[PDB]
Write a protein that holds these residues in place. Structure first.
Motif, PDB file in Angstrom:
ATOM      1  N   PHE A 145      89.536  29.159  16.162  1.00 20.45           N
ATOM      2  CA  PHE A 145      88.872  27.929  16.639  1.00 20.45           C
ATOM      3  C   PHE A 145      89.572  26.695  16.048  1.00 20.45           C
ATOM      4  N   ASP A 146      89.876  26.748  14.762  1.00 19.72           N
ATOM      5  CA  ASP A 146      90.528  25.609  14.083  1.00 19.72           C
ATOM      6  C   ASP A 146      91.912  25.346  14.680  1.00 19.72           C
ATOM      7  N   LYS A 149      91.675  23.599  18.190  1.00 22.20           N
ATOM      8  CA  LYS A 149      90.909  22.363  18.400  1.00 22.20           C
ATOM      9  C   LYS A 149      91.801  21.251  18.926  1.00 22.20           C
ATOM     10  N   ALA A 150      93.073  21.255  18.565  1.00 22.57           N
ATOM     11  CA  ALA A 150      93.966  20.179  19.022  1.00 22.57           C
ATOM     12  C   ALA A 150      94.105  20.198  20.531  1.00 22.57           C
ATOM     13  N   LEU A 152      91.952  21.855  22.787  1.00 25.27           N
ATOM     14  CA  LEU A 152      90.696  22.010  23.538  1.00 25.27           C
ATOM     15  C   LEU A 152      90.314  20.716  24.250  1.00 25.27           C
ATOM     16  N   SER A 154      87.324  19.871  24.570  1.00 22.28           N
ATOM     17  CA  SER A 154      86.247  19.451  23.646  1.00 22.28           C
ATOM     18  C   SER A 154      86.237  20.401  22.447  1.00 22.28           C
ATOM     19  N   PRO A 155      86.162  19.930  21.190  1.00 20.29           N
ATOM     20  CA  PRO A 155      86.201  20.828  20.052  1.00 20.29           C
ATOM     21  C   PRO A 155      84.940  21.625  19.924  1.00 20.29           C
ATOM     22  N   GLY A 172      85.851  25.186  24.508  1.00 21.85           N
ATOM     23  CA  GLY A 172      86.377  23.854  24.834  1.00 21.85           C
ATOM     24  C   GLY A 172      85.574  23.196  25.942  1.00 21.85           C
ATOM     25  N   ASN A 318      79.516  23.116  17.727  1.00 22.91           N
ATOM     26  CA  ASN A 318      80.242  21.841  17.854  1.00 22.91           C
ATOM     27  C   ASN A 318      81.064  21.565  16.607  1.00 22.91           C
ATOM     28  N   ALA A 320      83.508  19.307  15.862  1.00 26.30           N
ATOM     29  CA  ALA A 320      83.828  17.933  15.463  1.00 26.30           C
ATOM     30  C   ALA A 320      83.795  17.780  13.949  1.00 26.30           C
ATOM     31  N   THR A 321      84.398  16.638  13.458  1.00 24.99           N
ATOM     32  CA  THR A 321      84.662  16.457  12.024  1.00 24.99           C
ATOM     33  C   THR A 321      83.369  16.637  11.241  1.00 24.99           C
TER      34      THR A 321
END
Ligand SMILES: CC(C)CN(C[C@H](O)[C@H](CC1CCCCC1)NC(=O)[C@H](Cc1c[nH]c[nH+]1)NC(=O)[C@H](Cc1ccccc1)NC(=O)OC(C)(C)C)C(=O)N[C@@H](CCCC[NH3+])C(=O)N[C@@H](Cc1ccccc1)C(=O)O
Length: 330
Positions: A145-146, A149-150, A152, A154-155, A172, A318, A320-321
């Motif tokens: 997944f990590d 993420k770049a 996708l 959507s992360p 994604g 989700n 996201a950061t």
């Protein structure tokens, strides 16, 4: 980019779900257990001691044009259930449901515990927790997944687990056709590296919702729903003939029963697990007695929203950061 893959239970009990993944070039398809409670991608391989492989499909890195040895790197992991494995580490191309990541760390097992040897249906694990839990050293490796993420759209990645039926893992995107109503998001704590959140309370069958914080983790890799002792006690009190059994290791009851439903809060939202989801199966083929799908977390140390909880929902991871967990009815 996006990926979509069918996940199928390995047996009639929904003990676990396997999802096919393509590794290397050309592609070698293995059936992995997607595990949001861990962060190692590991497989049965040409390197695993022979007497320990048992019907599983193995990953042969020497047949992959894109594999490279991560030199120096080793790994070793044990799971809540006591099972373990260890070995060394390749990078290679890995694809799930059409979503391709290159230079994915693929952890190749040299040894595996007796539990995995006896599990013919599972060729290895794909870990979807936070990368801080990865066991490769001396430098930890990113999850699938990590790494994804770049690229996708959507992360995120959603889990849509079937009740005695296949389901879907999506990467994604969110399939608005898959659930009913709206998704309710709740905050996640990454302090322990898990998808850790706090439930707002619970109800049994048609009775009152009790506001009480339940801290737990969403784990696709755990079968059952493990809650605090006094919540579990409140549930089984509404089932006559249910009793705790030392010998079987949890609450059992007549297969005959109609089980009440169980509701758990997500913020102001409510997710209802149908009673039949909690009727796990007879403890033995032909028995009057069946094993409960809700059990006490007291011996585990942590509440686990496992597959019995998660397959009653559409769940959004989700990443996201600042991560969050989304739940919808379906
Ligand atoms: C802590 C939990 C929430 C996360 N987790 C559990 C995994 O998701 C892991 C995924 C599995 C492993 C076996 C193969 C299939 C995949 N799940 C499990 O270990 C659970 C645990 C459990 C609870 N109650 C009874 N068993 N297993 C299950 O739920 C199995 C799944 C299964 C399916 C098919 C065939 C076999 C097994 N089902 C099952 O047993 O069903 C029946 C009860 C009906 C028999 C972990 O293993 N996490 C590791 C991360 C490792 C990171 C290392 N840097 C860990 O914390 N390991 C700890 C263990 C631990 C943690 C906390 C507290 C105590 C011990 C350790 O260090 O040793």
């Amino acid at each position: 980019s996006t990926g979509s893959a069918t996940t199928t239970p390995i047996d009639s009990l929904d003990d676990a779900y396997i999802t096919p993944v393509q590794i290397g070039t050309p592609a070698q398809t293995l059936n992995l257990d997607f595990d949001t409670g861990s962060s190692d991608l590991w497989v049965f391989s040409s390197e695993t001691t022979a007497s320990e492989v048992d019907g599983q499909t193995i990953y042969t890195p020497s047949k992959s044009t894109t594999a490279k040895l991560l030199s120096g790197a080793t790994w070793s992991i044990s799971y809540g259930d006591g099972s373990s494995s260890s070995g060394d580490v390749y990078t290679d191309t890995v694809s799930v449901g059409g979503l391709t990541v290159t230079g994915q760390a693929v952890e190749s097992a040299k040894k595996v515990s007796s539990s995995f040897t006896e599990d013919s249906t599972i060729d290895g694990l794909l870990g979807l927790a936070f990368s801080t839990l990865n066991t490769v050293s001396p430098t930890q490796q990113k999850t699938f997944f990590d790494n994804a993420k770049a690229s996708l759209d959507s992360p995120v990645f959603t889990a849509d687990l079937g009740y005695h039926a296949p389901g879907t893992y999506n990467f994604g995107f969110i399939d608005t056709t898959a659930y009913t109503g709206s998704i309710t998001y709740t905050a996640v704590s990454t302090k322990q590296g898990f998808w850790e959140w706090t439930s707002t309370g619970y109800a049994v069958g048609s009775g009152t919702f009790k506001s009480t914080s339940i801290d737990g983790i969403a784990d696709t890799g755990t079968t059952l729903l493990y809650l605090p002792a006094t919540v579990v006690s409140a549930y089984w009190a509404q089932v006559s003939g249910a009793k705790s059994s030392s010998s079987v290791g949890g609450y059992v009851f007549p297969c005959s029963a109609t089980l009440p439903s169980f509701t758990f809060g997500v913020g102001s939202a409510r997710i209802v697990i149908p009673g039949d989801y909690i009727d796990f199966g007879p403890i033995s083929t032909g028995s009057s007695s069946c094993f409960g799908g809700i059990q006490s977390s007291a011996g585990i140390g942590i509440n686990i929203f496992g597959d019995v909880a998660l397959k009653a929902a559409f769940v959004v991871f989700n990443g996201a950061t600042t991560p969050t967990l989304g739940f919808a009815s379906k």
